[PDB]
RNA sequence: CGGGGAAUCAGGGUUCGAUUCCGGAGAGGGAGCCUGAGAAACGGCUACCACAUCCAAGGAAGGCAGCAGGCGCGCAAAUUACCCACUCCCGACCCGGGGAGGUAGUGACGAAAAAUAACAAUACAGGACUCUUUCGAGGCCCUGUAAUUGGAAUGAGUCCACUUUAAAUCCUUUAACGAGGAUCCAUUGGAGGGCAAGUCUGGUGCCAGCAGCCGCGGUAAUUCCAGCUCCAAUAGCGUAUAUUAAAGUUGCUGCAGUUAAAAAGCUCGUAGUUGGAUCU
């Protein structure tokens, strides 16, 4: 009774990953992280927004 | 209270070791009865033969059937139950298969919903379950 | 038995807490200020400074006229003056505990190439050092973590074999000039 | 710079008597045997198995 | 096996030390010898015990816990390579010999250094200095989006040669070739809390599964399976296990014993521990 195996993984529709531009690595990536968090800062009255904040 | 004399060294160290034997982790490590009841026999991993596939029922608040396997270890002949983690990964296992098993993370203690499982399957037929699940490699038989 | 030496150290320590926002921000600020590859360079400089301060704090426990304290203290003070972190006026064992990580990061070859106008950016300075365009006195130095001594700072040059130095323009200019 | 070591002898006879054979062979003044180690080890054991003037026959 | 020592550690401590240096022990297990200055020696002998090789069936020959290598065992560990050039050792010896040792091969045990791109011009965008009541006007820097352009510098590799070396290889030195993003494309884990980073979208519907712990999933799932995005470390990152600190949860420093685990029913009493002033 019951005991399916791989039910949901075999159910879910296969969506292909989109082809995107590659990420910078090493010192360049740390430079981009620094310039995004500490250089071009936008002032905020309460600062309630995260980096992955959507809606 | 405690003895605090300048000649009380052997009293202090003798009482220390006698009350050290009352520590649970110390008695697990040093008495040597838990090490012989341990199926792995002081090993990080063991390698065994799949005897059968088991649906283990999850404990009271959670309702699920966890896919486990009864394995007999090669080096001592003891029988254990090992959990097959990801979904559909029991289908990569057949009966009488060569399987590498590790502990599950709590040092011989059962973990989470699964009642009485201390072990998980790491490798099946000398290829990892991770590479089979992510589809990097193929399995022989 | 083999004729081999097995002496080796680790030049950094991993911090105690994995995810603390203040430490992450401070280390990323250091990386951005000095153009460093990862957190491990920050941790390496921090470990060097911690070793120096532990040595000084071990020295300060002895009597002021102790011979070991005097000898090791003047040795440590001269070593910290020669790299340009301490000054001659403040050459005392108590001032060593007032040292910063940013004091040691100014002494790297990357920072000194950027400050002397040889490069126009700190990242450009790291590139130029790695590209074998920078020499110190006469040796070509390829390491950006090269700590510049105080007597060695006054002559950092462009390594005459480089295109920015004496001559012999590189691969791209030779290919582009050989078009017509 | 390139840094090396150099020696000037008084005559060629002293040079032949005092240089290692391999630095003489770089100038063509020495010839090494072409036999490897394993060949003469096995030959030594094979002639260890035999006795007398018959030792020189095996090889 | 013991030390020298190692990991961790405020201070005190805990744990490890088969392992290259010093000492001991033993060559399948025991036992007895010969030679010799030195051995109860095993790349010496003689037995018995257990294994096991060639047989013409009478006999004969064994000992890798040396170097490679093989089987077996297992979670678990490398080439049946080259040299006596270096270091030393032995001999009748400046000459011979050394799987000692050296050199290469395998090697993400572990440690050190360190790429994966930088810059310039433009189009937006900020933050400043001057002039303006303000709006604004500029020549001052900075930032990425660049479905925008531009040549310059390169190491990876390809590969003459020299150098290295016993002979090589590698490193270093160098001719020649070698860079525009569909590349010479960086991974491993995670995104409810602890603990840094989504109440995004689709699918599933107490199923499949996730989840160290608390918990999530029974039709709006921030936790499953995916896509996008984001976070951490980064040539590395997971997981299992032993151990150390967290543990003032073994407490000498430094814990507790009314009600939370805990003071013997009571007294005597030997060893043990501790023991009042006082002498210049």
Swiss-Prot record, chain A:
Entry protein name: Small ribosomal subunit protein eS30
Full-protein residues shown: 79 to 133 of 133
Subunit structure: Component of the 40S subunit of the ribosome.
Residues the record lists as N6-succinyllysine modifications: 47
Organism: Homo sapiens (Human)
Region (Disordered): 6-32
Composition skew (Basic residues), residue ranges: 19-32
Compartment annotation: Cytoplasm; Nucleus
Function according to Swiss-Prot or TrEMBL: Component of the 40S subunit of the ribosome. Contributes to the assembly and function of 40S ribosomal subunits.
Swiss-Prot record, chain B:
GO molecular function: RNA binding; structural constituent of ribosome
Disordered, as annotated region: 1-25
Record flagged with keyword Endoplasmic reticulum: yes
Modified residues (N6-succinyllysine): 53
Subcellular localization: Cytoplasm, Cytosol; Cytoplasm; Rough endoplasmic reticulum; Nucleus, Nucleolus
Protein origin, superkingdom: Eukaryota
Modification sites for 3-hydroxyproline: 61
Keyword Nucleus: yes
Entry comment on modification after translation: Hydroxylation at Pro-61 affects translation termination efficiency.
InterPro entries (UniProt xref): NA-bd_OB-fold, Ribosomal_uS12, Ribosomal_uS12_euk/arc
Pfam families: Ribosom_S12_S23 (PF00164)
Family annotation (NCBIfam families): PRK04211.1 (NF003254), uS12_E_A (TIGR00982)
Subunit and interaction comment: Component of the 40S small ribosomal subunit. Part of the small subunit (SSU) processome, composed of more than 70 proteins and the RNA chaperone small nucleolar RNA (snoRNA) U3.
Clinical condition linked: Brachycephaly, trichomegaly, and developmental delay: An autosomal dominant developmental disorder characterized by brachycephaly, ciliary trichomegaly, dysmorphic features of the face and hands, hearing loss, and developmental delay with short stature. Intellectual disability and autism spectrum disorder may be present in some patients.
Protein's name according to its UniProt entry: Small ribosomal subunit protein uS12
Gene name tied to this protein: RPS23
Swiss-Prot record, chain C:
Phosphoserine modified-residue sites: 152, 162
Gene Ontology BP term (one): translation
Pfam families assigned: Ribosomal_S4, S4
Family: Belongs to the universal ribosomal protein uS4 family.
Residue(s) carrying N6-acetyllysine: 65, 115, 154
Protein known as: Small ribosomal subunit protein uS4
Ranges for domain S4 RNA-binding: 107-180
The keyword Transport appears for this protein: no
UniProt xrefs under InterPro entries: Ribosomal_uS4, Ribosomal_uS4_CS, Ribosomal_uS4_euk/arc, Ribosomal_uS4_N, S4_RNA-bd, S4_RNA-bd_sf
Curated annotation (Swiss-Prot), chain D:
Keyword presence, Metal-binding: no
GO molecular-function term, one example from the UniProt record: RNA binding
GO biological-process terms attached to the record: cytoplasmic translation; erythrocyte homeostasis; ribosomal small subunit biogenesis; rRNA processing; translation
Disulphide connectivity of cysteines: none
Subcellular location per the Swiss-Prot or TrEMBL entry: Cytoplasm; Nucleus, Nucleolus
Function: Component of the small ribosomal subunit. The ribosome is a large ribonucleoprotein complex responsible for the synthesis of proteins in the cell. Required for processing of pre-rRNA and maturation of 40S ribosomal subunits. Part of the small subunit (SSU) processome, first precursor of the small eukaryotic ribosomal subunit.
Disorder: Diamond-Blackfan anemia 3: A form of Diamond-Blackfan anemia, a congenital non-regenerative hypoplastic anemia that usually presents early in infancy. Diamond-Blackfan anemia is characterized by a moderate to severe macrocytic anemia, erythroblastopenia, and an increased risk of developing leukemia. 30 to 40% of Diamond-Blackfan anemia patients present with short stature and congenital anomalies, the most frequent being craniofacial (Pierre-Robin syndrome and cleft palate), thumb and urogenital anomalies.
Name recorded for this polypeptide: Small ribosomal subunit protein eS24
Keyword annotations: Acetylation, Cytoplasm, Diamond-Blackfan anemia, Isopeptide bond, Nucleus, Phosphoprotein, Ribonucleoprotein, Ribosomal protein, Ubl conjugation
Biased composition (Basic residues): 34-52
Region Disordered, residue ranges: 25-59
Stated family: Belongs to the eukaryotic ribosomal protein eS24 family.
Gene label: RPS24
Keyword match Manganese: no
